[PDB]
A paper describes a structure:
Growth-factor receptor-bound protein 2 (Grb2) is an adaptor protein that has an SH3-SH2-SH3 domain architecture. The Grb2 SH2 domain mediates activation of the Ras pathway through binding to phosphotyrosyl motifs on either growth factor receptors such as epidermal growth factor receptor or other adaptor proteins such as Shc. Grb2 SH2 specifically binds to the pY-X-N-X consensus sequence where X is any amino acid; however, it binds to pY-(L/V)-N-(V/P) with higher affinity. A number of signaling molecules such as Grb2 and phosphatidylinositol 3-kinase (PI3K) bind to the cytoplasmic region of CD28 and activate CD28-mediated costimulatory signaling.
In this study, we report the crystal structure of Grb2 SH2 in complex with a CD28-derived peptide consisting of 8 amino acids, including the pY-M-N-M sequence, at a resolution of 1.35 Å. In general, the folds of the Grb2 SH2 domain were essentially the same as those previously reported; consisting of a central, antiparallel β-sheet flanked by 2 α-helices. The phosphorylated CD28 peptide binds to the Grb2 SH2 recognition site across the exposed edge of the central β-sheet. The phosphate moiety of the phosphotyrosine (pTyr191pep, the amino acid residues of the CD28-derived peptide are denoted with a “pep” suffix hereafter) directly interacts with the side chains of Arg67, Arg86, Ser88, Ser90, and Ser96. The side-chain of Asn193pep at the pY+2 position forms a pair of hydrogen bonds with the main-chain amide and carbonyl groups of Lys109. The 2 methionine residues, which are unique to the CD28-derived peptide, appear to contribute to the binding mainly through hydrophobic interactions. The peptide adopts a bent conformation similar to the type-I β-turn, which is the canonical conformation of peptides bound to Grb2 SH2. However, the hallmark hydrogen bond between the main-chain oxygen of pY and the main-chain nitrogen of the pY+3 residue (Met194pep in our structure) is not formed. Consequently, the CD28-derived peptide is slightly lifted away from Grb2 SH2, making it a more “twisted” conformation than a canonical type-I β-turn. A very strong electron density, which was interpreted as a cadmium ion, was observed between 2 molecules in the crystal lattice.
Author numbering: 57 to 152
Write the structure that this text describes.
C-alpha cells in the first residue's frame, strides 16, 4: 500500500507526528475535518509543519497550484521531484 495516507488524523495530530520526523519533506495526506470529504497535505519543514489544501476542479482533478492530476497518488509522486512550496524547495518523501 501507500504509506502516506493517514485517513482522518486531525491537523494537530499530523503536526505532532511530523514534527518528530528527521527530514524536511516528510509528509502525509489526511482527510480534512474542515472541508469534509476533501484532503489536506501536511509536510515537515524545519521546526514547522506546513499544510496545503488539495484543490479540486470541475473534472475531479487534484492539484496544489496549477498542474493537475487524476489521483492523489499522481499528485504525490509529481511532488517527489517538483517543490510543493513556492517559498522554499520542499520535495515530498515518505515518513520514516
Amino acid at each position: 500500500p501507500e504509506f502516506w495516507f493517514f485517513g482522518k488524523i486531525p491537523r494537530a495530530k499530523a503536526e505532532e507526528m511530523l514534527s518528530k520526523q528527521r527530514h524536511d519533506g516528510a509528509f502525509l495526506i489526511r482527510e480534512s475535518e474542515s472541508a469534509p470529504g476533501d484532503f489536506s497535505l501536511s509536510v515537515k519543514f524545519g521546526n514547522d509543519v506546513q499544510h496545503f489544501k488539495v484543490l479540486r476542479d470541475g473534472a475531479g482533478k487534484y492539484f496544489l497550484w496549477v498542474v493537475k492530476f487524476n489521483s492523489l497518488n499522481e499528485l504525490v509522486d509529481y511532488h517527489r521531484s517538483t517543490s510543493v512550496s513556492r517559498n522554499q524547495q520542499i520535495f515530498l518523501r515518505d515518513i520514516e
